Design a protein around this motif. Structure first.
Motif, PDB file in Angstrom:
ATOM      1  N   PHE A 111      41.621  38.805  49.925  1.00 55.81           N
ATOM      2  CA  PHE A 111      40.579  38.318  49.047  1.00 55.81           C
ATOM      3  C   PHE A 111      41.169  37.333  48.075  1.00 55.81           C
ATOM      4  CE2 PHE A 111      38.878  42.831  49.596  1.00 55.81           C
ATOM      5  CZ  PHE A 111      37.625  42.537  50.064  1.00 55.81           C
ATOM      6  N   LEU A 112      40.473  36.243  47.839  1.00 60.17           N
ATOM      7  CA  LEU A 112      40.881  35.247  46.859  1.00 60.17           C
ATOM      8  C   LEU A 112      39.793  35.204  45.784  1.00 60.17           C
ATOM      9  CD1 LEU A 112      41.770  32.461  49.434  1.00 60.17           C
ATOM     10  CD2 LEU A 112      43.425  33.807  48.155  1.00 60.17           C
ATOM     11  N   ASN A 113      40.027  34.465  44.683  1.00 59.15           N
ATOM     12  CA  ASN A 113      39.017  34.289  43.639  1.00 59.15           C
ATOM     13  C   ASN A 113      37.714  33.726  44.261  1.00 59.15           C
ATOM     14  OD1 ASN A 113      37.933  34.292  41.055  1.00 59.15           O
ATOM     15  ND2 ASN A 113      38.844  32.308  40.510  1.00 59.15           N
TER      16      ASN A 113
ATOM     17  N   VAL B 253      38.633  50.096  36.066  1.00 56.65           N
ATOM     18  CA  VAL B 253      37.610  49.525  35.195  1.00 56.65           C
ATOM     19  C   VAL B 253      37.535  48.018  35.477  1.00 56.65           C
ATOM     20  CG1 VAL B 253      37.672  51.316  33.400  1.00 56.65           C
ATOM     21  CG2 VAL B 253      39.212  49.333  33.230  1.00 56.65           C
ATOM     22  N   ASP B 254      36.356  47.418  35.292  1.00 58.13           N
ATOM     23  CA  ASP B 254      36.187  45.981  35.537  1.00 58.13           C
ATOM     24  C   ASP B 254      36.574  45.173  34.283  1.00 58.13           C
ATOM     25  OD1 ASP B 254      33.794  47.031  34.429  1.00 58.13           O
ATOM     26  OD2 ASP B 254      32.468  45.782  35.675  1.00 58.13           O
ATOM     27  N   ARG B 255      37.878  45.145  34.039  1.00 62.18           N
ATOM     28  CA  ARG B 255      38.464  44.483  32.890  1.00 62.18           C
ATOM     29  C   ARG B 255      39.847  43.944  33.290  1.00 62.18           C
ATOM     30  NH1 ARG B 255      40.148  47.288  27.026  1.00 62.18           N
ATOM     31  NH2 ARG B 255      41.574  45.582  26.467  1.00 62.18           N
TER      32      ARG B 255
ATOM     33  N   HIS C 110      33.419  44.352  46.627  1.00 64.82           N
ATOM     34  CA  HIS C 110      34.676  43.917  46.041  1.00 64.82           C
ATOM     35  C   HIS C 110      34.519  43.441  44.601  1.00 64.82           C
ATOM     36  CE1 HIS C 110      38.647  42.703  45.678  1.00 64.82           C
ATOM     37  NE2 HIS C 110      38.384  41.405  45.541  1.00 64.82           N
ATOM     38  N   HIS C 111      35.411  43.907  43.697  1.00 60.91           N
ATOM     39  CA  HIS C 111      35.348  43.469  42.308  1.00 60.91           C
ATOM     40  C   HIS C 111      36.610  42.831  41.811  1.00 60.91           C
ATOM     41  CE1 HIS C 111      31.615  45.586  40.715  1.00 60.91           C
ATOM     42  NE2 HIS C 111      31.676  45.994  41.989  1.00 60.91           N
ATOM     43  N   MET C 112      37.789  43.342  42.220  1.00 63.64           N
ATOM     44  CA  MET C 112      38.990  42.799  41.594  1.00 63.64           C
ATOM     45  C   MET C 112      40.269  42.984  42.344  1.00 63.64           C
ATOM     46  SD  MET C 112      39.523  45.475  38.447  1.00 63.64           S
ATOM     47  CE  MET C 112      41.134  45.048  38.076  1.00 63.64           C
ATOM     48  N   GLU C 113      41.246  42.190  41.939  1.00 60.72           N
ATOM     49  CA  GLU C 113      42.571  42.295  42.484  1.00 60.72           C
ATOM     50  C   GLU C 113      43.453  42.807  41.366  1.00 60.72           C
ATOM     51  OE1 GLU C 113      44.869  38.636  43.699  1.00 60.72           O
ATOM     52  OE2 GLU C 113      44.614  39.635  45.654  1.00 60.72           O
TER      53      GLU C 113
END
Ligand SMILES: CC[C@@](O)(C(=O)Nc1cnccc1C)c1cccc(Cl)c1
Ligand SMILES: CC[C@@](O)(C(=O)Nc1cnccc1C)c1cccc(Cl)c1
Lengths: 304, 304
Positions: free
Chosen positions: B140-142, B186-188, B163-166
């Motif tokens: 996954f990329l940005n 967490v999404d931070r 998908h939310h983050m790397e």
């Protein structure tokens, strides 16, 4: 970040899969415009497969003997012809889900996605490379014949493979969409030799660049080599000889990473000579050769 | 014959992907019926990501700030709400390509297919396992945020991941379709620990059965073990402890091959203790754990 054996999204191909039945044999067909393409061995019984005379067998078949079903609707067959090892069944309805497409004959070492099907229904999708010996190491069971391989460029599907058979060795053989076998294979149940396979050197180098881009760098060393010195090692390890054409295709990855192609060849040389010493590269304990330099750029840049 | 890391056909999911833009941030959304699901961090700027107050950020947004585009047509947003870490944008049009679907929260060790997308467009499909530590090792990329994971049972798509983050370690974190993160994430944009990962023992055993079915038998030995003796070895090699529930799920593969589960455990024990001695199993030089017993049966039987 991360690097996976990624297949193309299969939707455009799923909309083309149909079931073809002739007599008591059922396999997959590919419905594009008003034509259904399938392996000509759909006309054979198991007894015919030992030594089939396809011309004589096809003469006992009429349009009404080919049963073509798309989902749950039946297609009306208005023509039939044999082109090499494929049958082309002309139907009275153009597939409304026909994507923009081309038929291409790929080169050995090139990769493609396979949509494995049974009874005209898709079961899965995976990424393959056409081996240098023109076989594919797929996942296919009886009934998967007619399943196709393809690549996608934006909205265009280039069909490159149609599955026909499994060799006694467990590897797979098939044709381009004009029915021409890749390799020396014939569509007959007789023992057939697949020649010596070799590792696709340009793909291993491309995958080593993908590894560097993603942080796996332990294999980079302080050495360099020449094309001739590297090819002496490639020959000894049954790797394809690397040419300036291969170096040229690796150019973008060499530019992005700042690692000269011959320096990456020296890393590959040391890996061949010393092994991985119990280490991994991109989650693999062996040198991966089923990613082309194009695949690496596409995956590493998010091409849709 | 042959065994591949096979993904589900992605067509049904491709028809649900949309692009969601809010302010200057663009990511993927999933359009099912008259609702578009996407990661709530679509409302953040890069500066907000360090410590976002999602409730306060969402209050400065109105329906007209969420731009949802499906292919080239714009969807009209008539409602917006936050559920955990996902945003649900109510649209005035039901997706005509909505497949039969369910939202499921998978267990660690279970597998699924990911359709990687950028700007609402599919780039590729690959098969993943949810790690025991609730991370996924994806690609996954940005811009890939909002890409989903799923399984398919005949005509029903069970969505299990968004998908939310790397993480700073290069591994991936996301939520179920109700916006609940898998794991402690967490999404931070703060450094977050993924705990110790372990190998999914039941999946390795399932893959060993797949290897036997396909002819790779060199690792079969004359030994057996007990669940307790095997688990002493599993602990030492960071493998998940095997339970009678796992043995029970391996039952069909034990029956088909005639190899008792504890005899396969003794083969796995010797492989852990001695390594592969430069040999391969199903084209892998390591023990593969991203195939469940269900996956092995499905692939080995041609389920469509
Ligand atoms: C059943 C035989 C065959 O249909 C085949 O290989 N099918 C087959 C294909 N893929 C995987 C497994 C199987 C079994 C056959 C054999 C020789 C020549 C040709 Cl053209 C076809
Ligand atoms: C750019 C940051 C971020 O959007 C992310 O990880 N995206 C991202 C996702 N997958 C692969 C690569 C990238 C870059 C981010 C970071 C922390 C928390 C959250 Cl919820 C999101």
């Amino acid at each position: 970040s991360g690097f996976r054996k990624m297949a193309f999204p299969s939707g455009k191909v799923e909309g083309c899969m149909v079931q073809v039945t002739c007599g008591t044999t059922t396999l997959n067909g590919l419905w594009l415009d008003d034509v259904v393409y399938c392996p000509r061995h759909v006309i054979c019984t198991s007894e015919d497969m030992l030594n089939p005379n396809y011309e004589d067998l096809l003469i006992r078949k009429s349009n009404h003997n080919f049963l073509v079903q798309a989902g749950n609707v039946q297609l009306r067959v208005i023509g039939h012809s044999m082109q090499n090892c494929v049958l082309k069944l002309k139907v009275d309805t153009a597939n409304p889900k026909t994507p923009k497409y081309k038929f291409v004959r790929i080169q050995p070492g090139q990769t493609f996605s396979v949509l494995a099907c049974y009874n005209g229904s898709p079961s899965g999708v995976y990424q393959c490379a056409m081996r240098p010996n023109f076989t594919i190491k797929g996942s296919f069971l009886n009934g998967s014949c007619g399943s196709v391989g393809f690549n996608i460029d934006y909205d265009c599907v280039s069909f490159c493979y149609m599955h026909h058979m499994e060799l006694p060795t467990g590897v797979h053989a098939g044709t381009d969409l004009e029915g021409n076998f890749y390799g020396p294979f014939v569509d007959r149940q007789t023992a057939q030799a697949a020649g010596t396979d070799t590792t696709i050197t340009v793909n291993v180098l491309a995958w080593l660049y993908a590894a560097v881009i993603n942080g796996d760098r332990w294999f980079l060393n302080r050495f360099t080599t020449t094309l001739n010195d590297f090819n002496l090692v490639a020959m000894k390890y049954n790797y394809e000889p690397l040419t300036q054409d291969h170096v040229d295709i690796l150019g973008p990855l060499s530019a992005q990473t700042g690692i000269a192609v011959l320096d990456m060849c020296a890393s590959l040389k040391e890996l061949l000579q010393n092994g991985m010493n119990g280490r991994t590269i991109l989650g693999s304990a062996l040198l991966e050769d089923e990613f082309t330099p194009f695949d690496v750029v596409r995956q590493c840049s998010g091409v849709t």
